Design a binder for this molecule. Structure first.
Ligand SMILES: O=c1c(C2=Nc3ccccc3S(=O)(=O)N2)c(O)c2cc(F)ccc2n1CCC1CC1
Length: 557
């Protein structure tokens, strides 16, 4: 029951790929250890293929079926609607990969006759045929990391026409069903601050809290045909139009369960029998399957008063401690059960008795103080990957601006405020591009955002306290400082000096620019200004933000 079979044809690129960090006049102001930063390319795709190709065995017991029955009971309450062709078209990113059949994303977005006629033909084919495997493209992702090299991850996706049809059939389902089935355990319904609140309140709900993260090794490749059919059975519990039931069956049989892999040159590379990383249901499917396996494993291990938090393949569990020795024993049983369910561990899970020591969604809770001196919890992460990616983006325009996503999601953090805000506002100022909209990605969806709207966006997501936090923990400060030394980034004292300059330059611009100076860089002046609620912030349409995850799902706004 192999995750993949291969022909020996290579996974090929679409254009020249760079692995070495490009350097321009701005690079050394941010990062001097250029050799630490690299991008993955198709040259490492063979190594990735070896890692993700293996046999999956699955033994399913009564705990698994009991949890599944409960999930299906909750799913039965969901009513989901078909999207119109127009609605689905307007969800397509402007720079989404063009179709092989003679039209592109902008043709889709404009509702061109050619595009709309083809989408109708694809839809009719889904209704009429529930058996023929749907072709997919396989490509090596180009992502940036700091050394200590990862092989490229693989992306697998069907044609643009099919992607639009997935939205028509499943957008409402994948946006609504997860929170109904999993309630407060569904992670993608939370902003960063909401996630912190849930984690803190859950920790406090236990007499003697214990928590752990669980890392499944190569999750997508552990997902079996069984798993994908079980997912479909959950979708079909919803109140759906008959037409939608048929399209969902067809997509499951023809696309989600598996299909042929074609490289960028049109050659057959092999066949997939595990999760595709580039379909609409990747996020919802991984979340449901992870929750199902983990909930059943909790029961196997007799964990007391378990509360889970699930975002795709990323899992956190907080429960009542039965003692340190008993806790470690329970985790072994948990892992054994997950392994039987085809979710074997990467790193073995570790019990933690301090909430700040748990990492999940690459992040941890930490504590700072607000302007009144109150202790406030907030979400942070190790800044190594953010800074490596920011270095790349200093010298190259990319389709997704990680620095922008990171400023939005980690606005309250020491590193996002002192380094990312300072560095990028200085660059944009110099080019007068503050008002130019940029694409970023949050929970898998693409947003087009004007940097000048950051103050209002931050206030809405994090509150005004994001502009006032200070007295960060020694642990957090020490981690940031050591990261800077590692990458050869100037120390925080240099960044404070630069932020005073950037703040003054923004204030001299007037308007929204001055608001950025005032709010984003109040921390850099000795005599702070008041900072009152921004009237524009109460006006922003942040509907669609933090409802669901759509990683690989080709979703825009
Ligand atoms: O977890 C993320 C995700 C995210 N997490 C995921 C976790 C598991 C599966 C799929 C995703 S995903 O591809 O949908 N995206 C982001 O897209 C993200 C983007 C930012 F710009 C900054 C931080 C981000 N974080 C950490 C923030 C923490 C509240 C959860």
């Amino acid at each position: 029951h192999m995750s993949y079979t291969w022909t020996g044809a290579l996974i090929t690129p679409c254009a020249a790929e760079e692995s070495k960090l490009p350097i321009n006049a701005l690079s050394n102001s941010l990062l001097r250890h250029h050799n630490m930063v690299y991008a993955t390319t198709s040259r490492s795709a063979g190594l990735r293929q070896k890692k993700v190709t293996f046999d999956r065995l699955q033994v399913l017991d009564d705990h698994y079926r009991d949890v599944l029955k409960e999930m299906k009971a909750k799913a039965s309450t969901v009513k989901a609607k078909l999207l119109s062709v127009e609605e689905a078209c307007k969800l397509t990113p402007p720079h989404s990969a063009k179709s092989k059949f003679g039209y592109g994303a902008k043709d889709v977005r404009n509702l061109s006759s050619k595009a709309v006629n083809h989408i109708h033909s694809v839809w009719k084919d889904l209704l009429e045929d529930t058996v023929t495997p749907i072709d997919t493209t396989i490509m090596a992702k180009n992502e940036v990391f700091c050394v200590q090299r990862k092989p490229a991850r693989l992306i697998v996706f069907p044609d643009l026409g099919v992607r639009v049809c997935e939205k028509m059939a499943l957008y409402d389902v994948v946006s609504t069903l997860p929170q109904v089935v999993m309630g407060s355990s569904y992670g993608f319904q939370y902003s960063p601050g909401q996630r912190v609140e849930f984690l803190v309140n859950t920790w406090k709900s236990k007499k003697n809290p214990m928590g752990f993260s669980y890392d499944t090794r190569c999750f997508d490749s552990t997902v079996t045909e069984n798993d994908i059919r079980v997912e479909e059975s959950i979708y079909q519990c919803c109140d759906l139009a008959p037409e939608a039931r048929q399209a969902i069956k067809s997509l499951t049989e023809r696309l989600y369960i598996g299909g042929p892999l074609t490289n960028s040159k049109g050659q057959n590379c092999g066949y997939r029998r595990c999760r595709a990383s580039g379909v609409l249901t990747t996020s919802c499917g991984n979340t449901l399957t992870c929750y199902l396996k983990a909930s059943a494993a909790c029961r196997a291990a007799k964990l007391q008063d378990c509360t889970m938090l699930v975002n795709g393949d990323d899992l956190v569990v907080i429960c009542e401690s039965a003692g340190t020795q008993e806790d470690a024993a329970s985790l072994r049983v948990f892992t054994e059960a997950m392994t039987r369910y085809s979710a074997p561990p990467g790193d073995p899970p570790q019990p933690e008795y301090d909430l700040e020591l748990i990492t999940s969604c690459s992040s941890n809770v930490s504590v700072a103080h607000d302007a009144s001196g109150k202790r406030v919890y907030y979400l942070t992460r190790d800044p190594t990957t953010p800074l490596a990616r920011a270095a790349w983006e200093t010298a190259r325009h990319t389709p997704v601006n990680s620095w922008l996503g990171n400023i939005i999601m980690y606005a309250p953090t020491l590193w996002a405020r002192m380094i990312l805000m300072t560095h990028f506002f200085s660059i944009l100022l110099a080019q007068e591009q503050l008002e130019k909209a940029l694409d970023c990605q949050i929970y898998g969806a693409c947003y087009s955002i004007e940097p000048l709207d950051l103050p209002q966006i931050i206030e809405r997501l994090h509150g005004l306290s994001a502009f006032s936090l200070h007295s960060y923990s020694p642990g957090e400060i020490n981690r940031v400082a050591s990261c800077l030394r590692k990458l050869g980034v100037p120390p925080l004292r240099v960044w404070r000096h630069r932020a005073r300059s950037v703040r003054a330059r923004l204030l001299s611009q007037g308007g929204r620019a001055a608001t950025c100076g005032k709010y984003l860089f109040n921390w850099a002046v000795k005599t702070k200004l008041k900072l009152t609620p921004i009237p524009a912030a109460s006006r922003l349409d942040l509907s669609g933000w933090f409802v669901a995850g759509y990683s690989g799902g080709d979703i825009y706004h």
